[PDB]
Design a protein around this ligand. Sequence first.
Ligand SMILES: [Ca+2]
Ligand SMILES: [Ca+2]
Ligand SMILES: [Ca+2]
Ligand SMILES: [Ca+2]
Ligand SMILES: [Ca+2]
Lengths: 93, 93
Amino acid sequence: GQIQLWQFLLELLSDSANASCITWEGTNGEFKMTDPDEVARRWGERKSKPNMNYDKLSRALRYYYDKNIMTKVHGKRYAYKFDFHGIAQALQP
Amino acid sequence: GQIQLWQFLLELLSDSANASCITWEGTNGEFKMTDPDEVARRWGERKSKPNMNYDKLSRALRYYYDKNIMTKVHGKRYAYKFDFHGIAQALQP
DNA sequence: ACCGGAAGTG
DNA sequence: CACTTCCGGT
DNA sequence: ACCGGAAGTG
DNA sequence: CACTTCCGGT
Ligand SMILES: [Ca+2]
Ligand SMILES: [Ca+2]
Ligand SMILES: [Ca+2]
Ligand SMILES: [Ca+2]
Ligand SMILES: [Ca+2]
């Protein structure tokens, strides 16, 4: 199906075998990408789009700021925080 | 039908019209039930289980503590906090 | 009010 | 399993 | 590395 | 419609 980036990141985060590239860290919702290039590769793989990289992936995350789906952890790089306010709304059709 | 309780609460919390009975409040994840009995009634209405009350509903939420799907905001009553660790795993098939 | 054990449901 | 039902704890 | 405007895609 | 692509800012 037509999977979302916020759904894809939760998929990777749920399994601890992906700890090399992405992992939960800090308060509730906060996670960091320990290998942003690896995460961006797998997102391009799922979408059938091998031109994907972290610079293009991060602008995809940026649109979630206005949607209230997630936000940046200011200071700790490659680290973002999911926000239930928008996730809950995005979960419904 | 075929729905989880954690999914049902996020469904209600997405629509702000439901602020009479339940609403987001506090840090990321934290919500409270301003009319706990009204929430329990709609859960019984959804599940087709007419004897549902808060006492029965609260024990369903206590099973989520060991699952890491949510936790209790200690002190503030009728107030619980979703936890992304369990919500991530629970969303997958 | 909130907690978790115990037994039961399809 | 994911609750529902019930109850003796704090 | 992170920010958001802009134009384009399936 | 949710990104994808590109880029001139900080
Ligand atoms: Ca049992
Ligand atoms: Ca009692
Ligand atoms: Ca006891
Ligand atoms: Ca600009
Ligand atoms: Ca540049």
